[PDB]
Ligand binder design. Structure first.
Ligand SMILES: Cc1cn([C@H]2C[C@H](OP(=O)(O)O)[C@@H](COP(=O)(O)O)O2)c(=O)[nH]c1=O
Ligand SMILES: [Ca+2]
Length: 132
């Protein structure tokens, strides 16, 4: 079963990338199963701001690797990130600040959960989904 590990949020890089202190060393993590806009694209600032708000307000950050590859081709950890028990990946999607994306079968544990959040965000026309 997947498991959550301790970490500390050092820097929000952008809406879906964070620098964490993991096992006492800095490591950049890309969130699984999501794609936020770049900082210079519409909703980019907002998505970055959501991560920054987590850093600022979350008392507890946890990293959950999925069942497959743990590091991408750029050396970034690939994980689900939780803030005070709330999955950041899911929250971004639920708020329409990320699309479900990069769904590889080896790391797909939370796919249907996120697709559920996406469908709600789309029905509500939030953020990314408010755009025609
Ligand atoms: C989420 C995720 C992204 N990536 C890679 C694919 C994209 O690489 P390429 O673009 O070279 O194909 C890149 C997107 O990252 P960003 O969305 O952070 O720019 O991250 C993975 O390899 N595995 C993943 O699970
Ligand atoms: Ca992105």
């Amino acid at each position: 079963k997947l498991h959550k590990e301790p970490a500390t949020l050092i820097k929000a890089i952008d809406g879906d990338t964070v620098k964490l202190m993991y096992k006492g060393q800095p490591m950049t993590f890309r969130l699984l199963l999501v794609d936020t806009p770049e900082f210079n694209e519409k909703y980019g600032p907002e998505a970055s701001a959501f991560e920054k708000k987590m850093k600022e307000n979350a008392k507890k950050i946890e990293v959950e690797f999925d069942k497959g590859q743990r590091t991408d081709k750029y050396g970034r950890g690939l994980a689900y990130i939780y803030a005070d028990g709330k999955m950041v990946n899911e929250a971004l999607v639920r708020q329409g600040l990320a699309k479900v994306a990069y769904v590889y079968k080896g790391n797909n544990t939370h796919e249907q959960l996120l697709r559920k959040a996406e469908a709600q965000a789309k029905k509500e026309k939030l953020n990314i989904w408010s755009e025609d």
